[PDB]
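Annotators were shown the component list below and the corresponding predicted structure, then asked to write short factual statements about the assembly.
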Amino acid sequence: AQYEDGKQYTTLEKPVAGAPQVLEFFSFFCPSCYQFEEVLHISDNVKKKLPEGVKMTKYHVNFMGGDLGKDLTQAWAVAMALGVEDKVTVPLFEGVQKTQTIRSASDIRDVFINAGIKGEEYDAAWNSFVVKSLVAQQEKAAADVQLRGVPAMFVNGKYQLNPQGMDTSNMDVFVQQYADTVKYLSEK
Amino acid sequence: AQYEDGKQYTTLEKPVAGAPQVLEFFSFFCPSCYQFEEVLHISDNVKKKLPEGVKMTKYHVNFMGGDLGKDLTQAWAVAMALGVEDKVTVPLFEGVQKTQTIRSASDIRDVFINAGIKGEEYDAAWNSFVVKSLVAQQEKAAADVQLRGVPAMFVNGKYQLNPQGMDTSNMDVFVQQYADTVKYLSEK
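Structure shown to annotators:
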């Protein structure tokens, strides 16, 4: 019809049971991810279009940035545990891609402290088993969908967005087209 | 200082004849390019240390920001043809990345009008043969060097700078090392 499998989205051959309603994967080393978040604001626009109740989950991946990539997945787990995602997302993206000042786990820590998190609070969470649990969950979710690239978004553990079938001349129209597709899929 | 191939710079397998003495590629969607321009002032520092009769060339690329990227490449050609680069560079970077007031082609025109350029003049230049030529030229240059990403700088169409092989600990030192590498290379 208007929304076609293979055009705006693709259907998973092996559906994932018990998957979050809307699952987004990204990496702070991922260029398009920087665009999606910083310039396009995909997540926020998708969120403002979702039905009442429907929860959105964002996970970081290990396959980019090698050593630092894994440090960032752990740092994201810390951000989730402390509920400070909205405070560190921008500084982390800019630190890795814009100023290129993030080079070790120590630099990641500086970002949280600069954002207002106390050192002892950060260190406690960083070493917590609650955080290790969150890291495992992130890895497990990527494994379930056989993730090979980011950014990526899955709806109801069955459909995956395909931004290739969309016009990019006007950013605003692209964002709404993307948001509308997620909405459509979440009711399907 | 000491310069060695593979470290501070790289030699091109296939040299590009007729290439400008110092060629720099960027994109208004590129975060580190924005940093290089507004904070580090990389280009100015390079110019300050260039020998007599050496001119710099800065070209915009298409592979970032979808179809808007193409329009920005044409707008850059307009800036070059009108000789207003120094008046619109920062406002375009901010418009795309910071204030996010540039979401389509129409928004770019406003940037020029606000800088003092008459609308009629912009529209006329936009469709000019000079501009269509400049656009083709920028695209070709990128193709000739098989540009994979930005920012990027090439010297005598033979050497390519490798910032990763440079001292990053101190930005002032980095900036000067980058500028000196350019001078060293231009002298051979």
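Statements collected:
1. The CA atoms of residues 73 and 123 of chain A lie 15 Å apart.
2. Strands of chain A lie at 9-11, 22-26, 56-60, 152-155, 159-161.
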